[PDB]
Amino acid sequence: AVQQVRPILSVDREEARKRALNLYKAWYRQIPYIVMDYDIPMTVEQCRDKLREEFVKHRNVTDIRVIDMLVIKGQMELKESVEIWKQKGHIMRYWKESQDPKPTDFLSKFIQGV
Amino acid sequence: GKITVPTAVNLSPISGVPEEHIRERRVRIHIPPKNAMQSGTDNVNTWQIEFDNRERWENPLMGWASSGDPLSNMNVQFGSPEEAITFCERNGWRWYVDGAAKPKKERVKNYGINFAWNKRTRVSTK
Amino acid sequence: PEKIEVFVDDIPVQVVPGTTVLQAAAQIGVEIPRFCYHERLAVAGNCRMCLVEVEKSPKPVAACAMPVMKGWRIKTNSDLTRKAREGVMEFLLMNHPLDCPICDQGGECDLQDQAMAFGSDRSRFTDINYTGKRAVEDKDIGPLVKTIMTRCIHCTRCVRFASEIAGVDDLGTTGRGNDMQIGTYVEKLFLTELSGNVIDLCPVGA
Amino acid sequence: CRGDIEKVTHTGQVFDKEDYRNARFVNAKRYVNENWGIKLIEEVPPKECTERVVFCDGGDGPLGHPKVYINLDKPGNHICGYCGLRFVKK
Amino acid sequence: GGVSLDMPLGLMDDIYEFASKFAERLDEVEDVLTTNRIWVQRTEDIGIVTAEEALNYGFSGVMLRGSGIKWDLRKQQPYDAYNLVNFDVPIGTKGDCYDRYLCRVEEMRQSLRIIDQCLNQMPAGEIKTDDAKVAPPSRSEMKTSMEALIHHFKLFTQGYQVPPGATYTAIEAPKGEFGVYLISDGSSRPYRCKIKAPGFAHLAALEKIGKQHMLADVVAIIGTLDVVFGEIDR
Amino acid sequence: LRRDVSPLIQRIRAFLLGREHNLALRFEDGLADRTQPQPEIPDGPSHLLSANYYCQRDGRREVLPPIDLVEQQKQLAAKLPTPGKVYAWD
Amino acid sequence: DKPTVRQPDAVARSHLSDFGRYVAECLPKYVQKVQLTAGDELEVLIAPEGVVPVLQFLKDHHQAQFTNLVDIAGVDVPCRKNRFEVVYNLLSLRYNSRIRVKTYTDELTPLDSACEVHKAANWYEREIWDMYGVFFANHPDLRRILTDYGFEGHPQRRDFPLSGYVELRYDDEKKRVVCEPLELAQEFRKFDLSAPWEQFPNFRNANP
Amino acid sequence: IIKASTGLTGLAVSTNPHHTLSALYGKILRAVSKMPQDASYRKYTEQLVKQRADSVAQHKDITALEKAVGCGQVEELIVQAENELILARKMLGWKPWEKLVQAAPAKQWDWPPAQIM
Numbered sequence A: 001a002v003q004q005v006r007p008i009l010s011v012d013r014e015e016a017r018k019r020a021l022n023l024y025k026a027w028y029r030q031i032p033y034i035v036m037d038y039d040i041p042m043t044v045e046q047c048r049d050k051l052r053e054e055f056v057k058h059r060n061v062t063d064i065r066v067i068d069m070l071v072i073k074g075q076m077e078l079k080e081s082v083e084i085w086k087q088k089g090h091i092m093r094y095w096k097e098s099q100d101p102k103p104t105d106f107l108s109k110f111i112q113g114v
Numbered sequence B: 001g002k003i004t005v006p007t008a009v010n011l012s013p014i015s016g017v018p019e020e021h022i023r024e025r026r027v028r029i030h031i032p033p034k035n036a037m038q039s040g041t042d043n044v045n046t047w048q049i050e051f052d053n054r055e056r057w058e059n060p061l062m063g064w065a066s067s068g069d070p071l072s073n074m075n076v077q078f079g080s081p082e083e084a085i086t087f088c089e090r091n092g093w094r095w096y097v098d099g100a101a102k103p104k105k106e107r108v109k110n111y112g113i114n115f116a117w118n119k120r121t122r123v124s125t126k
Numbered sequence C: 001p002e003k004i005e006v007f008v009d010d011i012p013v014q015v016v017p018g019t020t021v022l023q024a025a026a027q028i029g030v031e032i033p034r035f036c037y038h039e040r041l042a043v044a045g046n047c048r049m050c051l052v053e054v055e056k057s058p059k060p061v062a063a064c065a066m067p068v069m070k071g072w073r074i075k076t077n078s079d080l081t082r083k084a085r086e087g088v089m090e091f092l093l094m095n096h097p098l099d100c101p102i103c104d105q106g107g108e109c110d111l112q113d114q115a116m117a118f119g120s121d122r123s124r125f126t127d128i129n130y131t132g133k134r135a136v137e138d139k140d141i142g143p144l145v146k147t148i149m150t151r152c153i154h155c156t157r158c159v160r161f162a163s164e165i166a167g168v169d170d171l172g173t174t175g176r177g178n179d180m181q182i183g184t185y186v187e188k189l190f191l192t193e194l195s196g197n198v199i200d201l202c203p204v205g206a
Numbered sequence D: 001c002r003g004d005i006e007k008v009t010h011t012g013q014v015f016d017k018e019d020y021r022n023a024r025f026v027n028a029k030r031y032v033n034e035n036w037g038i039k040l041i042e043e044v045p046p047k048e049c050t051e052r053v054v055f056c057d058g059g060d061g062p063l064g065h066p067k068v069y070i071n072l073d074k075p076g077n078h079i080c081g082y083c084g085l086r087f088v089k090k
Numbered sequence E: 001g002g003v004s005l006d007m008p009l010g011l012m013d014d015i016y017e018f019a020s021k022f023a024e025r026l027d028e029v030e031d032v033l034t035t036n037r038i039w040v041q042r043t044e045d046i047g048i049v050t051a052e053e054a055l056n057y058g059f060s061g062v063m064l065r066g067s068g069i070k071w072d073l074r075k076q077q078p079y080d081a082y083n084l085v086n087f088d089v090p091i092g093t094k095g096d097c098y099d100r101y102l103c104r105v106e107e108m109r110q111s112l113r114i115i116d117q118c119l120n121q122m123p124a125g126e127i128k129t130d131d132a133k134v135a136p137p138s139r140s141e142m143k144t145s146m147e148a149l150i151h152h153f154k155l156f157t158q159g160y161q162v163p164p165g166a167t168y169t170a171i172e173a174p175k176g177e178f179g180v181y182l183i184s185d186g187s188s189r190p191y192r193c194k195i196k197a198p199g200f201a202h203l204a205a206l207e208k209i210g211k212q213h214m215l216a217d218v219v220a221i222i223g224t225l226d227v228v229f230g231e232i233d234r
Numbered sequence F: 001l002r003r004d005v006s007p008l009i010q011r012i013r014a015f016l017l018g019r020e021h022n023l024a025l026r027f028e029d030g031l032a033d034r035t036q037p038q039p040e041i042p043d044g045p046s047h048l049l050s051a052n053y054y055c056q057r058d059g060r061r062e063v064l065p066p067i068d069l070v071e072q073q074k075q076l077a078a079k080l081p082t083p084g085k086v087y088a089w090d
Numbered sequence G: 001d002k003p004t005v006r007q008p009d010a011v012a013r014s015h016l017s018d019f020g021r022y023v024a025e026c027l028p029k030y031v032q033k034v035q036l037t038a039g040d041e042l043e044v045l046i047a048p049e050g051v052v053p054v055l056q057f058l059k060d061h062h063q064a065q066f067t068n069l070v071d072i073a074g075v076d077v078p079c080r081k082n083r084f085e086v087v088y089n090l091l092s093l094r095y096n097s098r099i100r101v102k103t104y105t106d107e108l109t110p111l112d113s114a115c116e117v118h119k120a121a122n123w124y125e126r127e128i129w130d131m132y133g134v135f136f137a138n139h140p141d142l143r144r145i146l147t148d149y150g151f152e153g154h155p156q157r158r159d160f161p162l163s164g165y166v167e168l169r170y171d172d173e174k175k176r177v178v179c180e181p182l183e184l185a186q187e188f189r190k191f192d193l194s195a196p197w198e199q200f201p202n203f204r205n206a207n208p
Numbered sequence H: 001i002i003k004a005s006t007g008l009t010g011l012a013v014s015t016n017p018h019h020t021l022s023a024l025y026g027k028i029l030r031a032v033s034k035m036p037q038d039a040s041y042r043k044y045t046e047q048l049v050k051q052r053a054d055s056v057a058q059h060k061d062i063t064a065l066e067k068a069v070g071c072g073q074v075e076e077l078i079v080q081a082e083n084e085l086i087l088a089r090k091m092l093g094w095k096p097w098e099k100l101v102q103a104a105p106a107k108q109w110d111w112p113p114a115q116i117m
């Protein structure tokens, strides 16, 4: 159940958690520049709450290569957010705008057919 | 420069699958059915995974069939069931197997049983 | 019941005695094209697509009715086998109607797939401008079966399924020569609870 | 009133008066072909032939349908499945 | 398997008159573009590409031959009667936009004599290959014979069965080297069709070429790179 | 005749061009005829009635799997090597 | 004579066979298998640890100047254990030849970047990363080159849908182009173009 | 008699190509002398560098040397010699004459993927 692979961007889970904390620190420092340089309705506190929500969404993972993959894609999205290549519509894709909240109860899904 | 990892990974966060498709979709691993109006079997030996059918509705404007399911047309080929199990557990899909292949049907085809004495296997036509 | 040694496609196989050449070759993976042999019906020779070349033999052998013996070398991919299959199949395709754009088994016809797989690429039939092709009248079978006997290749899968499994004797082949017709002599309803399977068992789509 | 909405097509289709889909025709014309194929193929007379099997080409050689042979031993009118022309044997 | 349709009658009787008339229009273009001093000032010593630059950075076609490399894929690896025609290959020296522009207009000049040779010798024969399982048959054979109707039906419903295997072909595009890495699994559909566009590899060196140049210099560099972004974006 | 200026403007244009001017636009008498007789397409090598078998000219079925070059020497053995001829691109 | 059958080039067969045995002899550590395919193309099947030392070798040797790198191609074959394969096509202008160097790579396992050897791998190795998720270690900048800036996922894998997961539409309430879950007006009609009869008997036992 | 230009952009005409080629071939030989003799790369490199050193020793003229070697101009010979020296100094670090570090996995290099058995 154990294989030897080539590590990507980490050699231990504490190092991977430390680099994820580097990613969170740089994202937290880049929040008020994102609110200032984009014409978005979301404020600084809402952006920080969304950043915390996207980190605790990926809280559940355990594997070193998977969490390093997540850190790499997060740093790429951050580099697309420091240099302004994303638009105001790309920034507001984290908040699910223009989407009706689907119900969770069985009765409303039964009436709506979902 | 190698590390130690478990051989079972979950690649559902690093893929592009949303939560509403990874949490409630059932994957059928199956051998596709042979067309009963054909005697060939070259399209049968390949295993494949497919997804469950979703709601397909009539278009309001024209008579076309519209579906909001993005994965209705995606069948992925595999050479063995166990590799499909490994793929479904690696990509985080909820899997089930429709049915294993038939191992062997032992049959004998003799031309002499069409014309037999005191046997009920004798044919009446030719 | 000791197994015997058969070299098919220069590949060894151990087969129990009494098996056909088609079964002894399908044990390893290679399949011979067929029209008048079903696995659940009686073996017959109404087509000659199963002609394979065995070594040190003057004539090709019909693989779906050949009880193979010890130490035969069967060559499925030989030149003589491919020439025999092309000749027999263009014989099958000589009088068949050009009905593929108006035939419901087009796209799942065995004749189309075996013409791409094993048949020739063109026609040598230069006698269509004069004396024409064969056309026969449609037989009267009831509301489950649409019958056009011009597309039929006379393989007697339907007759064998009626006589053996369905149990009704109303189907048969009438006449001699090119004029054999695979249908009932009189206007009768082929009534059976298992009639729909005959639509599955017709290889072309008559 | 507009008579182009309730007129049936050759496929047997018409939007009834309680349908919401007739609101698309309040500013645009509903296109119904007045040249039905059924009457235009029933209008032509059948062709009488003496030989047992005939061939139907549908017109010119390369510009028609693929050639078929029809057996006229059965009494009645035999319809070509490509073009719809009817043959009959005396 | 060849071409879809045969040439219409009298097409070459217009192609010859057109190719006779094209050279005066070429000279009229060089009378206003070539050796005009403003065009030289916008095209000389601008975006200098060396030989090792074009060799290492994956350049192909004119970007190879602006710098002095004699690589033309119509002569080194011939294809489709390019070995039966005779022509010269334009080779630049300085590697700037002016040498690439002169190489492109000289390519337009040599294509006229390849056109002249192609109209001078043209055999009378078939247009498609006669394997009817890889090429569609004629409509008279489709409407007359049975095997051609079956092959027309099959090859226009599900494609011809290509044997399973990988190949990478590459010809001389006017932009550069156009390549197809086609990998087939034995079915009627390709498993993989990767396209090597030359404009992708030409555009990948814009980051090094465009540094320490002016804004109109960069405008002339994309003007002389001969990029089309449909194949770059694939 | 052709739609063209008088010869004074012709000689002015030919003097300003620096060369003898030929017309850049097509004409009806200088082009091929739009209506034209029907052609016949010649037959190829395999349209002969006799001695044509598909297996002798089968292009798709002569393709083999690729040869393992390490094992080819091992099963055939039971000036430095170059990948091609030397081309001088200087 | 067969004029409808393509005749192979023997001088592109013997030279490529001798060079394939030569490159198998010179690099036994990385090269697992060399093969000369139909169509006179040479394939070298390297280990994933030998991406840089093979492509450097064919770059700089006197008997192999494969100095041009035309394209880096990723193929996703999900049946295999290492699903992705990476194909480097190299052109030799001095000896007028071509080679293909193929390796196997999983999405989590990184691959050596050939950007130090050939600079065209500065961009081509990005494209596979944009389309398969093959991470190329020690790359100058590994960014997203072709898909949208807010795109989540790698599209050219066979486990990715053809129509994608999401669509874009203009919202005049938010005054911006917003992202919506996918609903097609007419679905993609999947045609079952499968051959029930095998047509190539030479490829029947080509898997072992 | 030296050439006016080499015909390639960015390549300068070498003033002393014979001494540069001989020194580069000697440096390649001194690099590959550290390698074990059972390695094939060392034997093939020694053979080609010895025959090219014999070519640059027999012919003291530039054009006769380019005709005798036959692989491009002599500046391209200097470029190829520097490239081979870089390759050899990388071979002393990489050590590729050993066994395979990773064998091919099962069902990896067969192309038709979904065929059973």
Ligand code: SF4
Pocket (backbone or CB within 6 Å): C096, C097, C098, C099, C100, C103, C104, C105, C106, C107, C109, C110, C111, C112, C151, C204, C205, C206
């Ligand atoms: S039975 Fe088969 S070959 Fe005959 S017309 Fe129908 S589809 Fe065509």
Ligand code: SF4
Pocket (backbone or CB within 6 Å): C151, C152, C153, C154, C155, C156, C157, C158, C159, C182, C201, C202, C203, C204, C205, C206
């Ligand atoms: S009708 Fe069909 S099943 Fe019966 S003999 Fe003819 S082809 Fe065979």
Ligand code: FES
Pocket (backbone or CB within 6 Å): C033, C034, C035, C036, C037, C044, C045, C046, C047, C048, C049, C050, C051, C062, C063, C064, C065
């Ligand atoms: S099916 Fe075997 S001979 Fe007819």
Ligand SMILES: [Zn+2]
Pocket (backbone or CB within 6 Å): D056, D057, D058, D065, D080, D081, D082, D083, D084, D085
């Ligand atoms: Zn008709």
